[PDB]
Ligand binder design. Structure first.
Ligand code: CL
Ligand code: NA
Ligand code: NA
Ligand code: NA
Length: 336
């Protein structure tokens, strides 16, 4: 049911170059949360693109649905801002009201909350209040205006490796959001694990305790039904420098991390591509350069996993990182 794609406004991909044929849902990232008013705002840079996002994409795929994403991975400061907004009923009200009005005023079908991350039992309770009040406002605004109701989603931590999932209210999510975008990636980055090559977003991780499978299982255990979970797919990976170009498998000795790299830039490298079916990851190497990332095989494998578990679907972060829609096409084809 969801073939999701995030369009990151700072990516350089123009809205008119998006191919919405491979998606059911497109997220326009990100509106900003104003710390002063606690209103959802759009930067003057984004206003023209956001205001025509939906009209533009629907010219190519009229059945595609759009949502305005709010927040971002903006560090602890942005988390603080969401946290303080969520703490008071009147702040939540400003955010709720402005988010709905902004979605309507800019022809979005929905809103996507990206608070990274609730990080206390109080954050948890406030998150539940925020989303119940948001659902209530969305149902009221829809009934009072006659306008078809906004969709509500949230992007959520995808593993205890990323953030303690105990600080999400699973039951409040199940009853109040239409689905969640489970961020099942960035588990084993080259910045955090610089001395051994890793699968950064492995489906399974039998040498440890965290994986996409662990995260999905925890979300289901936490009170969210599989039919409200969308599996996250990263369109980028991480790079390491190998100690020895001849020692180039998973968990190979590395001298350091060399950052994150878009899929489209990994494919550029050529070299040798491999697929590990135990962890479900691709990797690619040339000389001492090593990349751990999702290529078409692991994308297909993750999408098949999602479909077999009865998940709602999948989403990609983010679409500009793809190469000629290769991963987007692969994921859509895998789902059917
Ligand atoms: Cl490890
Ligand atoms: Na507006
Ligand atoms: Na609902
Ligand atoms: Na080095």
């Amino acid at each position: 049911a969801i073939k999701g794609g995030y369009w990151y406004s700072g990516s350089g991909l123009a809205v008119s170059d998006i191919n919405p044929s491979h998606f059911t849902h497109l997220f326009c990232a990100f509106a900003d949360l104003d710390p002063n008013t606690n209103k959802l705002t759009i930067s003057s840079s984004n206003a023209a693109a956001f205001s025509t996002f939906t009209q533009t994409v629907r010219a190519k795929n009229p059945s595609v649905k759009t949502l305005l994403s709010i927040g971002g991975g903006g560090g602890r400061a942005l988390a603080a801002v969401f946290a303080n907004m969520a703490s008071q009923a009147s702040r939540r009200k400003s955010f709720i009201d402005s988010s709905i009005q902004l979605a309507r005023r800019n022809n979005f079908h929905g809103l996507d909350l990206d608070w990274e991350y609730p990080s206390s039992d109080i954050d948890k309770t406030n998150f539940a209040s925020l989303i119940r009040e948001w659902r209530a406002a969305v149902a009221t605004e829809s009934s009072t205006s006659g306008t078809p109701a906004l969709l509500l989603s949230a992007a959520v931590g995808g593993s205890d490796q990323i953030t303690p999932l105990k600080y999400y209210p699973g039951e409040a999510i199940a009853n109040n959001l239409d689905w969640v975008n489970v961020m099942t990636y960035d588990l084993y980055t080259s910045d955090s694990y610089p001395t051994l090559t890793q699968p950064p977003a492995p489906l399974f991780y039998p040498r440890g305790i965290f994986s996409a499978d662990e995260g999905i299982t925890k979300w289901i255990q936490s009170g969210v039904p599989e039919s409200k979970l969308a599996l996250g797919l990263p369109f980028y990976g991480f790079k390491w420098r190998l100690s020895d170009p001849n020692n180039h498998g998973l968990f190979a000795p590395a001298t350091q991390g060399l950052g994150a790299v878009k899929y489209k830039d990994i494919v550029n490298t050529g070299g040798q591509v491999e697929f590990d079916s135990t962890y479900v990851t691709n990797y690619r190497f040339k000389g001492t350069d090593w990349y751990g990332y999702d290529d078409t095989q692991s994308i297909s494998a993750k999408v098949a996993y999602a479909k077999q578990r009865g998940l709602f679907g999948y989403f990609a972060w983010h679409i500009e990182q793809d190469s000629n829609w290769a991963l987007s096409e692969t994921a859509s084809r895998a789902w059917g």
